[PDB]
């Protein structure tokens, strides 16, 4: 059941086209997160959805009703600001009830609604406490409570948890996911963090320069990238070059990667003489120790440094050609075989069928 | 030690003539050069003077009216400038800055010439308009400066919550601008009670003010009745400012 | 609503500020008339009359007096603003409000009181003689020193506020970096603090200088007949002689300095950012 | 012994922030001060830099007291968080500001400034005002400005906090290489554990003005001394294991929440004592079985499976009702791994990979 359908929306600002073209549909009952580098235009999409800006072209529909030209006072859409946009001269009760008091709501129902909305936020005690006496987390909670009471069909968040520390942010992540599951309305989140998007969202949309690049489950974007930018944006990736020689079977293709032959899994149709990209993640590369001509099978390279991150050990391997390869593993100090092998001739292997192959 | 001494010296340099006037109010010497005892004759003599009291009443009423109108217009203009964002805001800022940094004599001359050409007799209206014109920029500057002590996104939050443009001013902007509005009114009242150039240029025989009466008495000689009037007006303004502060708070 | 207030304020400003200013700027290029004060003849005789030594010696004296008053105000006000910012924040508005309380009494009465206080046989001479510091009574009336003292006394508060606003807006870590890099108070004050506070200095100078050459009562009461400012000549020409074009021509010299100072302020503000 | 602090006390408006601090800083080392918000690290930085004065104690460099010497005469420079960066002068003048106040002859100012800008790769932007540059360029300008005077120690206060996650990693290695090449000690204040772990040679952890632990990253991460350090850096799983009887010198018998599990203890204990057994999330194992019968160890109960990308964390509720928080790599392509919910699993460790505290 579609909820918001954006068809053919174009926006030009000061003679510059921030969003050339955008087709996107938002369903009902999910946690949607918009991701990308700074300057892609997520905030513009959020503002046009909320109605604070007008569109040069296109249509926006909610429940098959057109609200493209409806002013941003009758839409059933609420937003949460980055600075929390809190009124200083009012109290928590007044801030929360500002929305209800201006919908011609009967006075016999305002107090229980606000007071129970503070229950879902865990601010029971501070009903009569003014702002500038509350911490940042409590101010964010007040903003969320203020946005929730009106019971909208779509709640928009704009970098809500960017200004807090680590542990409190991690707590509010699970708190927001639980709140979304409990209420039953769709959430839209704009953020620059990666693990934050991967922890909560049921659907991730990546934008760059006003263009949509990928849309799918966190698994479908982390493990099946569509282009080089998406693969390099989330996590670390290793770009290898290969040339196709011949096809062995329906799921195996012979190729020459970095001057050495290897077997890879390619599904789409290929022809000899084509150039392919082989992308591997650091966790999937296994590196053995070659003390004196032992286990010298596979790609050959030299390790130059060994970084210690506390939880994981970071190693950089220099290949014969001159391409840097980065390998990440765990760190077990109290375990025999392991430890330092600063300078020698190493070999690099990976478990079969763990590759990601991209054409062109 | 030395910092407080410098500040105290500046304050004493600014405040010494007032104490002298107050002391000479109760003095017996007519010229007031020396001290020759304590009397209350000057207050009784002032109480029987009519032109001086009329001038004082006219000055007080003029200050009140000009302060009220200037405060209203300046607050409206500042709210308009802050609420709406456009490329012309620096133009208006420069306009007000230029009208603020202008000589008093030039403004008085220009206003007199315009009023003479238009065919308007000098008096109450000319003085009131001149006072409002020269008191306008300060209230605008004060309210304009106060407003940026708060975030601008609050208005967008009100719009998203379902607020019309009329309710925003009543429920958000005005609560946060009342302390600035009171300051502008107090400053406007103070300025209009000290101007001597514009008032001396654009006044008429029908309306008589305290500066003109004092200037007329200067050529012949002034009596401590002016001192008694000054201290009475000081007490009245002292109670007025605290009353305005209590009303604002 | 959105444009109504803008239209109202623009119309008010145009009617009461710039239209009369352009009317006066053209009045100098007129011809003296005894009937309507103006005759539509374009003559330049008004300006060349200012080149006579009699009508030129007064202008230089007024300029010198204004310059000395402005410099004294700067020297006495910059330390006051700097020291006020280094005080607890709970007492700043109270001290900044006491600078305005004396303004409630009219300026002419205050000038008269100052004239009495500085008299030859009055106070500040009997007190300074009873406790032996000076041998003879000090004669200061009807001299440029009295005019400068009166101007400084009247116009002192108008310069402290812009300087305080500029100082209070400074960034504290900028000074700490200068101190850490090896700068004493003097080098810091010369090469970091002063450049960043130039707009405040220019605004204060504009607010002190231009009014100081229109105050005629100060020179009338404490200056005498040899110490005259521009305001006295303008008042005489506009209220007694009724030679309006001469006053219109004289005001142009006052407008030009204002324009030059505004240009300097604009260039300083542009360079600061 | 470059900088030593003995009995330093600092009270701010009657509130005490540094009760008693003894600290010695050696020569040619990277030192990072770590802790939560509001623990007085910036106060120590300012006191060393000369921005504030102590109420007690003595500070020295090379056996010369600096307790009352002002900031202008001390051979120590600092880098500010906000990149002060005087706006009315260019990059060249900003870098040369320090030299002109030391009365340096004009024949050497330009080569020194140019070399300092070379050390941070800022040759081309020699004449640009500090508003046409980005955050990284401004940070490099500040770093180059601090290091021209050749100080005996460089003080850094949250230098790279306001940058992205890509430039941060590059400039961490850049700063480490610069410190190695130049040859002065560095003091760093940061709120991130990863930076301290990957960029330092000695870490001091502070909380409420007191030093909790000081040592190399290996000792700090893997051999904590108390329960605060074990938990500030990375997740920890605390288990109560009362000792009823002891079997031999190192192999002690412990009733770990009603279980039968023997562990390693390197210090003397007596029966009836209370011991805390600490394990990291990555040092625990699970066992998946289709049958609902509980076996292979204690109870198993999974709330969710997080799937934060690189790693998958699973909750294991025990009989007593406390979480376990396992963390281990997510290999998708697997013939026998893929998860199952709400089963009766088991938890195990790797034979003395744990840490035991009294």
Author numbering:
A (entry chain A): 15 to 374
B (entry chain C): 5 to 253
C (entry chain B): 7 to 279
D (entry chain D): 16 to 373
Authors' text:
The PotD-PotABC protein complex in Escherichia coli, belonging to the adenosine triphosphate–binding cassette transporter family, is a spermidine-preferential uptake system. In general, ATP binding, hydrolysis, and phosphate release trigger conformational changes in the transporter, leading to the uptake of extracellular polyamines. Here, we report structural details of the polyamine uptake system PotD-PotABC in various states.
The overall architecture of the apo PotABC complex, consisting of two PotA subunits, one PotB, and one PotC, adopts an “inward-facing” conformation, as observed for the type 1 ABC transporter. In this complex, the two PotA subunits are assembled as a homodimer and located entirely in the cytosol, whereas PotB and PotC form a heterodimeric transmembrane complex, with both proteins contributing six transmembrane helices arranged with a twofold pseudosymmetry. Despite a sequence identity of only 21.9% between PotB and PotC, their tertiary structures are overall similar, with a root mean square deviation (RMSD) of 3.97 Å for the 247 pairs of Cα atoms. The only notable variation lies in the periplasmic loop 2 (P2). Namely, PotB has one more helix (starting from Y129 to L137) in the P2 loop compared to PotC. PotA, the cytosolic subunit of the complex, contains both the nucleotide-binding domain (NBD) and the regulatory domain. The NBD is capable of binding and hydrolyzing ATP, thereby providing the energy required for Spd uptake. In addition, it interacts with the “coupling helices” of PotB and PotC through a cleft located just beneath the inner membrane. In the apo conformation of the PotABC complex (state 1), the PotB (D226 and K241) and PotC (Y219) form the plane interaction network to enclose the PotABC translocation pathway at the periplasmic side.
